[PDB]
Design an enzyme around this catalytic site. Structure first.
Site, PDB file in Angstrom:
ATOM      1  N   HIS A  60     -63.520 -24.545  -0.226  1.00 34.94           N
ATOM      2  CA  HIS A  60     -64.283 -24.818  -1.443  1.00 34.94           C
ATOM      3  C   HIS A  60     -63.643 -24.267  -2.740  1.00 34.94           C
ATOM      4  O   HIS A  60     -64.035 -24.620  -3.831  1.00 34.94           O
ATOM      5  CB  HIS A  60     -65.708 -24.339  -1.317  1.00 34.94           C
ATOM      6  CG  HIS A  60     -65.830 -22.885  -1.016  1.00 34.94           C
ATOM      7  ND1 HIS A  60     -65.928 -21.933  -1.994  1.00 34.94           N
ATOM      8  CD2 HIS A  60     -65.863 -22.219   0.156  1.00 34.94           C
ATOM      9  CE1 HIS A  60     -66.003 -20.745  -1.441  1.00 34.94           C
ATOM     10  NE2 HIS A  60     -65.965 -20.891  -0.141  1.00 34.94           N
ATOM     11  N   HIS A  90     -61.155 -14.951  -8.175  1.00 37.99           N
ATOM     12  CA  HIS A  90     -61.058 -16.403  -7.891  1.00 37.99           C
ATOM     13  C   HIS A  90     -61.662 -17.142  -9.176  1.00 37.99           C
ATOM     14  O   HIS A  90     -62.106 -16.423 -10.160  1.00 37.99           O
ATOM     15  CB  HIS A  90     -61.875 -16.705  -6.632  1.00 37.99           C
ATOM     16  CG  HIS A  90     -63.319 -16.346  -6.777  1.00 37.99           C
ATOM     17  ND1 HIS A  90     -63.866 -15.221  -6.180  1.00 37.99           N
ATOM     18  CD2 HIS A  90     -64.347 -16.979  -7.393  1.00 37.99           C
ATOM     19  CE1 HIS A  90     -65.155 -15.136  -6.499  1.00 37.99           C
ATOM     20  NE2 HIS A  90     -65.440 -16.152  -7.291  1.00 37.99           N
ATOM     21  N   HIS A  92     -64.010 -20.643 -10.764  1.00 40.50           N
ATOM     22  CA  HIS A  92     -64.816 -21.855 -10.482  1.00 40.50           C
ATOM     23  C   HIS A  92     -64.446 -22.850 -11.536  1.00 40.50           C
ATOM     24  O   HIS A  92     -64.015 -22.474 -12.645  1.00 40.50           O
ATOM     25  CB  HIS A  92     -66.290 -21.562 -10.623  1.00 40.50           C
ATOM     26  CG  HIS A  92     -66.776 -20.548  -9.648  1.00 40.50           C
ATOM     27  ND1 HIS A  92     -67.515 -20.882  -8.535  1.00 40.50           N
ATOM     28  CD2 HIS A  92     -66.557 -19.220  -9.578  1.00 40.50           C
ATOM     29  CE1 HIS A  92     -67.787 -19.780  -7.838  1.00 40.50           C
ATOM     30  NE2 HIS A  92     -67.213 -18.760  -8.452  1.00 40.50           N
ATOM     31  N   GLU A 102     -69.764 -21.189 -14.639  1.00 34.98           N
ATOM     32  CA  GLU A 102     -70.994 -21.003 -13.883  1.00 34.98           C
ATOM     33  C   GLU A 102     -71.977 -20.471 -14.904  1.00 34.98           C
ATOM     34  O   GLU A 102     -73.069 -21.099 -15.120  1.00 34.98           O
ATOM     35  CB  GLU A 102     -70.740 -20.012 -12.727  1.00 34.98           C
ATOM     36  CG  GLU A 102     -69.868 -20.637 -11.613  1.00 34.98           C
ATOM     37  CD  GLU A 102     -70.222 -20.168 -10.225  1.00 34.98           C
ATOM     38  OE1 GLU A 102     -70.682 -20.982  -9.428  1.00 34.98           O
ATOM     39  OE2 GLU A 102     -70.066 -18.973  -9.997  1.00 34.98           O
ATOM     40  N   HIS A 115     -63.781 -14.884 -11.958  1.00 34.10           N
ATOM     41  CA  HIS A 115     -64.591 -13.778 -11.331  1.00 34.10           C
ATOM     42  C   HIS A 115     -63.617 -12.760 -10.782  1.00 34.10           C
ATOM     43  O   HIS A 115     -62.727 -13.137 -10.022  1.00 34.10           O
ATOM     44  CB  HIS A 115     -65.384 -14.379 -10.274  1.00 34.10           C
ATOM     45  CG  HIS A 115     -66.551 -15.145 -10.852  1.00 34.10           C
ATOM     46  ND1 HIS A 115     -67.353 -16.011 -10.115  1.00 34.10           N
ATOM     47  CD2 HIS A 115     -67.046 -15.146 -12.119  1.00 34.10           C
ATOM     48  CE1 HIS A 115     -68.320 -16.490 -10.927  1.00 34.10           C
ATOM     49  NE2 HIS A 115     -68.108 -16.024 -12.145  1.00 34.10           N
ATOM     50  N   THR A 195     -72.741 -16.102  -6.371  1.00 29.68           N
ATOM     51  CA  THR A 195     -73.121 -17.466  -6.764  1.00 29.68           C
ATOM     52  C   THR A 195     -72.918 -18.562  -5.699  1.00 29.68           C
ATOM     53  O   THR A 195     -73.146 -19.728  -5.966  1.00 29.68           O
ATOM     54  CB  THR A 195     -72.404 -17.847  -8.078  1.00 29.68           C
ATOM     55  OG1 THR A 195     -71.036 -18.157  -7.762  1.00 29.68           O
ATOM     56  CG2 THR A 195     -72.473 -16.686  -9.100  1.00 29.68           C
TER      57      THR A 195
HETATM   58  N1  LIG Z   1     -70.487 -10.892   4.438  1.00 30.69           N
HETATM   59  C1  LIG Z   1     -69.645  -9.895   4.258  1.00 30.69           C
HETATM   60  N2  LIG Z   1     -69.442  -9.008   5.208  1.00 30.69           N
HETATM   61  N3  LIG Z   1     -68.979  -9.781   3.077  1.00 30.69           N
HETATM   62  C2  LIG Z   1     -69.081 -10.612   2.005  1.00 30.69           C
HETATM   63  S1  LIG Z   1     -70.182 -11.926   2.032  1.00 30.69           S
HETATM   64  C3  LIG Z   1     -69.660 -12.343   0.444  1.00 30.69           C
HETATM   65  C4  LIG Z   1     -68.712 -11.486   0.003  1.00 30.69           C
HETATM   66  C5  LIG Z   1     -68.030 -11.536  -1.322  1.00 30.69           C
HETATM   67  S2  LIG Z   1     -66.664 -12.727  -1.392  1.00 30.69           S
HETATM   68  C6  LIG Z   1     -66.852 -13.399  -3.066  1.00 30.69           C
HETATM   69  C7  LIG Z   1     -67.467 -14.783  -3.072  1.00 30.69           C
HETATM   70  C8  LIG Z   1     -68.611 -14.898  -4.020  1.00 30.69           C
HETATM   71  N4  LIG Z   1     -69.604 -15.766  -3.727  1.00 30.69           N
HETATM   72  N5  LIG Z   1     -68.648 -14.122  -5.181  1.00 30.69           N
HETATM   73  S3  LIG Z   1     -69.105 -14.563  -6.752  1.00 30.69           S
HETATM   74  N6  LIG Z   1     -68.704 -16.122  -6.889  1.00 30.69           N
HETATM   75  O1  LIG Z   1     -68.282 -13.756  -7.612  1.00 30.69           O
HETATM   76  O2  LIG Z   1     -70.540 -14.464  -6.793  1.00 30.69           O
HETATM   77  N7  LIG Z   1     -68.365 -10.481   0.889  1.00 30.69           N
HETATM   78 ZN   LIG Z   2     -67.286 -16.626  -8.119  1.00 32.08          ZN
END
Ligand SMILES: NC(N)=NC1=[SH]CC(CSCC/C(N)=N/S(N)(=O)=O)=N1
Ligand SMILES: [Zn+2]
Length: 256
Positions: A60, A90, A92, A102, A115, A195
């Site tokens: 993604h 990374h 978006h 975002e 980010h 996000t």
């Molecule tokens: N489950 C786990 N053990 N660790 C995890 S789950 C998500 C995570 C961070 S990776 C970053 C991906 C992200 N959605 N960040 S953002 N776009 O900055 O809000 N570490």
């Molecule tokens: Zn992000």
């Protein structure tokens, strides 16, 4: 989950009920409703380019990960007492130049968003532990405005031809991502979330007031990354931005 019509942001709540929670991100920052907070210290980053590790096509999006076994690369200041350890950055982006960020500022959509993510190493012993804790993550977001080619994006852009398809990964070393930050670190802060799934409400956001540039042809390189695995029909990574979510009475604070 993804960003398609069928597995995308408006479907996420079926598997991730927290998607309709009270601290979801991103948000629209209304500047007439922000409250200047006089206790906010300046943001201080100090990153070691030797912690840069690897770039990965995660289907993604793509991530640039850092070694996070110690405090060579840290975020301090702002709303924080704790020191936070850098682990990834990374981007978006959107289908066209018109949307892609975002966070929005007074309803205005930018072309992309950077980010830079960090985990609370004062309080927790790993990213896995920190990632679900209210104070576990600190993410700087920087709004990217389409205009002039950004040369600081160069090493990142040049690396993508080695990780064109889903799961590909390659070393990416000797890189200090504070070089990508805007010259003023004036910021907004609010309590929010990751996000995309799993959408944990574990993030203290630090949104820079000043944008950075990116060219229309730089954005095209992001969108020419592929979400399919090598050898399948090519599926361009056209967008990966979530729509802004209700503040639900949280307050956005301003350091300026
Ligand atoms: N489950 C786990 N053990 N660790 C995890 S789950 C998500 C995570 C961070 S990776 C970053 C991906 C992200 N959605 N960040 S953002 N776009 O900055 O809000 N570490
Ligand atoms: Zn992000």
């Amino acid at each position: 989950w993804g960003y398609d019509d069928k597995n995308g942001p408006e479907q996420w709540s079926k598997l991730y009920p927290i998607a309709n929670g009270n601290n979801q991100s991103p948000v629209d920052i209304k500047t007439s409703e922000t409250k200047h907070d006089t206790s906010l210290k300046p943001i201080s980053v100090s990153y070691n380019p030797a912690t840069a590790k690897e770039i990965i096509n995660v289907g993604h999006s793509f991530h640039v990960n850092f070694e996070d076994n110690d405090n060579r690369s840290v975020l301090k200041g702002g709303p924080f007492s704790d020191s936070y350890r850098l682990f990834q950055f990374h981007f978006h982006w959107g289908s066209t130049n018109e949307h892609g960020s975002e966070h929005t500022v007074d309803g205005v959509k930018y072309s992309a968003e950077l980010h830079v993510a960090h985990w609370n190493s004062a309080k927790y012993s790993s990213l896995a532990e920190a990632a679900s804790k209210a104070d576990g993550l600190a993410v700087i977001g920087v709004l990217m405005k389409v205009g002039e080619a950004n040369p600081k994006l160069q090493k990142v852009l040049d690396a993508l031809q080695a990780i064109k398809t889903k799961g590909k990964r390659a070393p990416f070393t000797n890189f200090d991502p504070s070089t990508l930050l805007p010259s003023s670190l004036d910021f907004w802060t609010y309590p929010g979330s990751l996000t995309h799934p799993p959408l944990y409400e574990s993030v203290t956001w630090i949104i820079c007031k000043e944008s950075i540039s990116v060219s229309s042809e730089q954005l095209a390189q992001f969108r020419s990354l592929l979400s399919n695995v090598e050898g399948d029909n090519a599926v361009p990574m056209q967008h990966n931005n979530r729509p802004t979510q209700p503040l639900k009475g949280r307050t956005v604070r301003a350091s300026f």
